[PDB]
């Protein structure tokens, strides 16, 4: 009853959808997508109709602030992909099912209505069930999108990545936040300069080799920047912690702590999978050494940055405050540049040749499509938390 | 800090173990088990050493009652399998690694110490971390055991099923319960007769065809009993609910409700996977019709029994109480007989020929090994809840 009644509906609805998505994709007789698209369209239709009904009856603690920006950005990218899908599937209809053209139209409506509904965020019991059903709708969409990339391998621009995984993650987090609240009662000129330099070098590395085989030098450049970037934050964040050593009536920021370590778990899994794939696999060559160092540095960077940020938030000589400004700002700028790759780069990175060979394309694509989008969550929260730290001290 | 510090350790430890288990088993270069066994032995060793240290320092709200009985029963079955493993791997050592014989010895010690530790259940912070680490230890063991069955296909009795999946489920549930409590501040002679008759018929069906190809008649007998058994409870439980219609200052039994629907999710997934495998797959033959009816009846039986039990618990003519006694007792006896198959029958049921062909042996074995052990949880709680209902009214 009440809150638990809505939760039980969601898991039962999610379990039903997940079985149909997984069963229809991982069976041996044939691969079914029209049924899966028919399923997703039905869930989106009901979810949109509850939201539309909710908006009309309402038009008469909020969680992270970066959540709304990510939802709109990834919602727009989904809309562009949904607009391109209707344009392509409308040129020919004689050789394609109706569900394949009706699905993008419904998805575009669902994204538009849900994004507006979440942006501006009685039967509190109906509201909870409707929110829980929509949360399961996005998680059902998230699983189908993840499965789609795994099973793989006029405009005609099919290269457009459907940002369904990222949009569903942002929507599901925002839907849960709303549901929980239903019925609630100077500068040393060393860090900023270095941080800006890595931002430009990192931005160039994304455009040249990450937007879309490649060359040996291109692979070394990507690893060289990442190793330098991750290594510098690990040293800088470690420096930040030892400064706190040479120096309480507030409560623990459980949400901030949980988000930092929780969202870092995605990159931990990527690193853990990478390490085994190099220890066994790559024949101790240059790429393996670079892969091993990059994977270890991600673990180290995430660990030490999280320690520095968590201690900095809870506490709340002139150089001490001055040095902490560049340390926070250098970590902020480096976190921003490392956010673009998990956000707009091809999930199976061209640098993951060793990983793809070890696990297979389908398994590795599943791993990155599940784990990398959580890196997005981590980078925004790291930037937002570092912004508060820099503003604070 | 505090409770969250222990939780964060567990997920980080569990994620590390899960990646090594999944990475070492689902890669293409080679399958690694000695490393996985070496990993599990290390986790069990530390978990056992914390428990041993905990017992010495302590020897100077409890959740379901059936939990302890399931832990001891499945712990004993694991010990018999661990005893048989040492006996087999000690006859020859010239052609097998040392980790393969050291693992059962450590596992037997871990099971013995953990079962005793959980049966009798300061540094509250150390205690929480130790409990969380052991909880992740059992979940790491649970995942490795599930993966072992999927990748498949003197005494010499290797047929002995390692009840690692079931024991780990019971241990992890008991470990979480303890962790949460750390630092806490007549008869109509119609149902019993019918229930007993189905118990004998069901018990015979388990011995004849379920302990261990088979015959067509054997398959029909298994479906005939299950369809009759599941159909009867659906009618009986529905009868029980309509009786409540022809007739509040207590709180909702959230744990009892969550356990009923939560544990029923495993059979829901089995049924959902079964239905698709018959709708597409089996060529509308006798087995498909029996499979379809059995899968649907499991969904119906679980749904209506849960509704009847949940309403019965919350509320707390002479025939009205008399009829409810046989209805509760008939459901109790039928729940007991349907508990033995998910508990001691071969996970890939001989009746799942259609399912195995549709999904493949590896995928279906993974599905049943994940979902069926939760049916155990459901059956015990259904029996325990029905026992309270029969005692109450």
Numbering used by the authors:
A (entry chain B), B (entry chain A): 27 to 86, 97 to 157, 164 to 195, 238 to 269, 288 to 314, 320 to 354, 361 to 429, 487 to 563
Paper text:
Mouse OTOP2 was expressed in HEK293F cells and purified in glyco-diosgenin (GDN) detergent. Its single-particle cryo-EM structures were determined using protein samples prepared at various pH conditions (5.0, 7.0, 8.0, and 9.0). The mOTOP2 structures at pH 8.0 and 9.0 are virtually identical. Among all, the mOTOP2 structures determined at pH 5.0 and 8.0 are better resolved and will be used to represent the low and high pH structures, respectively, in the following discussion. The structure difference in mOTOP2 between low and high pH conditions is quite subtle and mainly occurs at the N-terminal half of TM6 preceding the highly conserved glutamate (Glu250 in mOTOP2) important for proton transfer. At higher pH, however, the N-terminal half of the TM6 helix unwinds to an extended loop (right insets). This helix-to-loop structural transition occurs before the conserved Pro246 and vacates the space above Glu250 initially occupied by Pro246, allowing the Glu250 side chain to flip upwards and become completely exposed to the external solution. The outward-facing Glu250 is also stabilized by forming an H-bond with Tyr245 and a salt bridge with Arg517 in the high pH mOTOP2 structure. In state 1, a loop configuration at the N-terminal part of TM6 allows the glutamate to be exposed to the extracellular solution for protonation. The two conformations observed in mOTOP2 structures represent these first two states of the proton-conducting process, whereas the CeOTOP8 structures likely capture the next two states (states 3 and 4).
